[PDB]
């Protein structure tokens, strides 16, 4: 509260670390469904069903241009990619499996890096 401050994380390396995690995501062999935004003109249902599309290239642009206030807003966008994937794909599909795999991959890097 006013004039009562918590000790807080050293956050000075967060940008670099998030960039490294994103690079690791981008180069994972199962990243292919998530590298670019889904084409809303060509994919039936996607525009109506998925209220907030997100993809790695959009996250990369936001990270490169100061549009994440903190590391938690970055993690929210990454998770959104995989949450969207679950909404639109059966677990028993190539893309459904890819999303589950990438999510697991991300959360371990996240834990290992920041927790
Ligand atoms: O999540 C997605 C991205 C859009 C898409 C297009 C074609 C398809 O067979 C599956 C998908 N799932």
UniProtKB/Swiss-Prot annotation:
Domain of life assignment: Eukaryota
Its tissue distribution reads: Expressed at varying levels in several tissues, whereas a smaller transcript was expressed specifically in testis.
Q: Where in the cell is it found?
A: Nucleus
- Biological role: Regulatory subunit of the ATP-dependent BRF-1 and BRF-5 ISWI chromatin remodeling complexes, which form ordered nucleosome arrays on chromatin and facilitate access to DNA during DNA-templated processes such as DNA replication, transcription, and repair. Both complexes regulate the spacing of nucleosomes along the chromatin and have the ability to slide mononucleosomes to the center of a DNA template. The BRF-1 ISWI chromatin remodeling complex has a lower ATP hydrolysis rate than the BRF-5 ISWI chromatin remodeling complex.
Q: Subunit notes for this chain?
A: Component of the BRF-1 ISWI chromatin remodeling complex, at least composed of SMARCA1 and BAZ2B, which regulates the spacing of histone octamers on the DNA template to facilitate access to DNA. Within the BRF-1 ISWI chromatin remodeling complex interacts with SMARCA1; the interaction is direct. Component of the BRF-5 ISWI chromatin remodeling complex, at least composed of SMARCA5/SNF2H and BAZ2B, which regulates the spacing of histone octamers on the DNA template to facilitate access to DNA.
The family annotation for this protein states: Belongs to the WAL family.
Q: What is this protein called?
A: Bromodomain adjacent to zinc finger domain protein 2B
Question: What organism does the UniProt record list as the source?
Answer: Homo sapiens (Human)
What gene, per UniProt, encodes this protein?
BAZ2B
């Amino acid at each position: 509260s006013m004039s009562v401050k918590k000790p807080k994380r050293d956050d000075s390396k967060d940008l670099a670390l998030c960039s490294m995690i994103l690079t690791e995501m981008e180069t994972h062999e199962d990243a292919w469904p998530f590298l670019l935004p889904v084409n809303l003109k060509l994919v039936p249902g996607y525009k109506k069903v998925i209220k907030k599309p997100m993809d790695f290239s959009t996250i990369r642009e936001k990270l490169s241009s100061g549009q994440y206030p903190n590391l938690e807003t970055f993690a929210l966008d990454v998770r959104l990619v995989f949450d969207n994937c679950e909404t639109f794909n059966e677990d028993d599909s190539d893309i459904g499996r890819a999303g589950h795999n990438m999510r697991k991959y991300f959360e371990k890097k996240w834990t290992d890096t920041f927790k």
